Design a protein around this ligand. Structure first.
Ligand SMILES: [Mg+2]
Lengths: 89, 67, 100, 49
RNA sequence: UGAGUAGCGAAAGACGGGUGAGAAUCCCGUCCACCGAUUGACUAAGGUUUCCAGAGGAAGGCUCGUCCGCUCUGGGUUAGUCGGGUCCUAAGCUGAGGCCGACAGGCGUAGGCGAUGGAUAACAGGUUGAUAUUCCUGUACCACCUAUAAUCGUUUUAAUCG
RNA sequence: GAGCUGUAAGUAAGCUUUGAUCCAGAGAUUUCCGAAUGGGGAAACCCAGCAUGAGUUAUGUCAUGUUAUCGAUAUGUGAAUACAUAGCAUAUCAGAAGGCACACCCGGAGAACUGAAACAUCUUAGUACCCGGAGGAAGAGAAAGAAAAUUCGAUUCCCUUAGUAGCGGCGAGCGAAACGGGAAGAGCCCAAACCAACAAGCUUGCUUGUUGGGGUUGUAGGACACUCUACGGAGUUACAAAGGACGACAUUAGACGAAUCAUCUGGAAAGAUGAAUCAAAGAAGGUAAUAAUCCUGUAGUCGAAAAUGUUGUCUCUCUUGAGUGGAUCCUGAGUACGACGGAGCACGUGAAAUUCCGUCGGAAUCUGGGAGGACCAUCUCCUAAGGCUAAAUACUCUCUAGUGACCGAUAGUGAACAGUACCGUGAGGGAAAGGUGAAAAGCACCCCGGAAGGGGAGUGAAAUAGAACCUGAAACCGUGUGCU
């Protein structure tokens, strides 16, 4: 369930400047609440989580050659931690 | 791999599922950070997980008929 | 019906009379590729600088015929069950050696 | 309560209904007696109050 | 065809510098002018990515265009306290049993649902190209759970709760 | 049986003779909404109870089960009221609910424009629309019949009878049936008399109840009376019902399958010319032009691990059948009929017999009752008021195999690329749009240009076949000229 709650990390410039602090950004399953996210991070990465914020993103319109559609909707979570650090690249 | 799986005891299968799920999680983290280069492993591990679950359901179905 | 490694003869087209051997098959369109047959000239751009390149294009499979292993003439092909297994015959002789 | 025609003297026709002579009486239904609507003809014929 | 004709949707702009293949029309500067119970600043409905950065100039823009609410690529919305739900009810709508009705169905009791009203705990400063009473710093408050404890004394009563 | 990772081209990374991709049979998985059913709700969301379980010092969180309303079956309990009852509670079961091609079928309810050269009886028409119930068909069906011979012998459907007989502001119009010729063919079970038991009153007489047996009809049958008789027949489509065995076909993937070379023109031959061959195969489609012999096939022949569908033979499971007496007992009641108001029958209430609905009346019992077009008498035919029943017939959203003196992109489906652009608050309305080449060989490189476009070079048989790509008419717009 823990490997199914967290989907992948987000690597952008806003997320990197946040990682300058102790904040890490994830894309998570669109059905979970922030308590599940908090407990999943602690189990997978073996750290101590201080807080967690979440937000929802709508689907966007997009084209590929006269084919109008939508992207997937997504859920984003930002995890502040007290002790430890997550190794990424 | 379906014939190899059927030799495993029911408690080995659970441990194997638990390891394949972790191995698949790591690959999806590597793909997102942009350093994987071997994208064919993701489908392989998914299919192995599906086979393990199939063999696990077979035994649970079969024993209930005998019971 | 021809495999990937056989030695065939062209019976139709510009290059009728040449032998070559099969190197590709493409079964969905039934078009084989034979070495030295149906050569084309492509204009490839720099990807190094390109230029005109010569390779072979695929030919329709019914323009090609196998060669009788004994008398060395074009022949059609039949089938036969040996050891409960299917083999290829030359319609003018016996077995047809097609391993590779 | 089926339907039919009302006829005038010039034989014009209009739709119309015939109703049954329903009365509210107390009849014995399985176990406890109940109070239901029954026609007078069925009452004269095949049921006891 | 009418015909290179009618129109180009209320108004004050001028010049210098820049960039570019190309400039009345884009950017920067100075001067001048217009609104100012508002052409200023907030919150709702409604819209739904139009928001930001880099690139572009075929079509759209009543002219032009190096520009854009347009095209391409990549990004952006953070809450115990803000507004809703886990609270309350109005009009109204539904309604177990029930009453009525060719069928379809109509009405209605208890009870539900339903804000435009009642209840209800957070403020100052800092910071981004794009969010902020949400992020960061400082100082608070409100519920709930477990420990550490004076007061607790049949649990009638007594403190307690009801 | 050698390639493969959808349409779908790329690159990357991979899989596969230790048999992949692919085809058929059987399984496993199957988020959320929706009758939607734990409660709510603006479908695809929000908020809970109870019981287990993980985790936490403990709360918060999470996971898995279960919890609609009517119905059925048990148990307990029980108000105004003493017994009771209405209710109430608990537990098992999973009976209904919604959808469709709902075309055809059966019921309930039921128009108008129109025709009559106006219109009202009549017609359109029991049609359209709406509502309910179902099936692979439904409905009807075993004489209270049709008839008038010397009769026939359940129902349905086709042909004729016949636009006849009849009905009708006797107008407009509506319109049968019997006989005859065919398709198909099939008959049965109850209620009652009576008998045997069991049970309650009762006084053991009777009544009533329950089970079983018997028994089913017209020149009357059955009960009863009596005299002659026994396991062969029957069966799951009615006639009572279950389930086993072994077979045989047919589907649902497949396999084998005869026979041709050379020259000319050409980019290319299947064409032309010459000489051959097969045929239980000269259907058809591809292939660089038009192929029986090049490919896929065709005639013919062979094939199933598994699941379905039929169909046989055993098993299995049931079961006596006649005759004479004929009028002692039984033979379907608020029924048949009648009056009044309506409807359906070809038939407009009429010489209306015949068949149904509403309201009131209301029989007979074999020496009985009904019909034969008011009614009466005699004759002839039948025996109502209980139920079941295959086949011949209707239809096509579908599936499998085929066919056409059917269309060929303004045609044929609205739709060859769509119930989509788009329009409308909504119900709803509803388009336009096919073709490079045999093969992408889809124009390397040079020049003018910011680009777009172009000129050369090259590919190709052909580039005035360059993607706005087969052919390329007319309207319309230009450039150059002979005569004016
Ligand atoms: Mg002109």
């Amino acid at each position: 369930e823990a490997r199914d709650i967290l989907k992948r990390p987000v690597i952008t410039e806003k997320s990197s400047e946040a990682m300058a602090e102790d904040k890490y950004t994830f894309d998570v399953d669109t059905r979970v609440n922030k308590t599940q996210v908090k407990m999943a991070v602690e189990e997978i990465f073996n750290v101590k989580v201080a807080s967690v914020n979440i937000m929802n993103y709508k689907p966007k319109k997009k084209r590929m050659g006269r084919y109008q559609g939508y992207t997937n909707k997504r859920r984003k979570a930002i995890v502040t931690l007290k002790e430890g650090s997550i190794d990424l690249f | 791999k379906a014939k190899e799986i059927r030799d495993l005891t029911t408690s080995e299968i659970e441990e194997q599922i638990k390891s394949s799920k972790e191995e698949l999680f790591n690959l999806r983290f590597q793909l997102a950070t942009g350093q994987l280069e071997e994208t064919a492993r993701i489908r392989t591990v998914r299919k192995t997980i599906a086979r393990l679950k199939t063999v696990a359901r077979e035994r649970e179905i079969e024993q209930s008929k005998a019971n | 019906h021809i495999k990937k490694g056989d030695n065939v003869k062209v019976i139709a087209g510009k290059d009728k009379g040449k032998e070559g051997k099969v190197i590709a098959t493409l079964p969905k369109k039934d078009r084989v590729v034979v070495e030295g047959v149906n050569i084309m000239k492509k204009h490839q751009k720099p990807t190094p600088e390109g230029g005109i390149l010569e390779t072979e294009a695929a030919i329709h499979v019914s323009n090609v015929q196998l060669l009788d292993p004994k008398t060395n003439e074009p022949t059609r092909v039949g089938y036969k069950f040996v050891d409960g297994k299917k083999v290829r015959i030359a319609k003018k002789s016996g077995e047809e050696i097609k391993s590779n | 309560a089926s339907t039919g025609n009302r006829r005038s003297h010039a034989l014009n026709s209009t739709k119309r209904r015939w109703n049954a002579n329903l009365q509210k009486v107390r009849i014995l239904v399985d176990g406890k007696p109940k109070k239901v609507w029954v026609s007078a003809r069925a009452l004269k014929s095949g049921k006891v109050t």
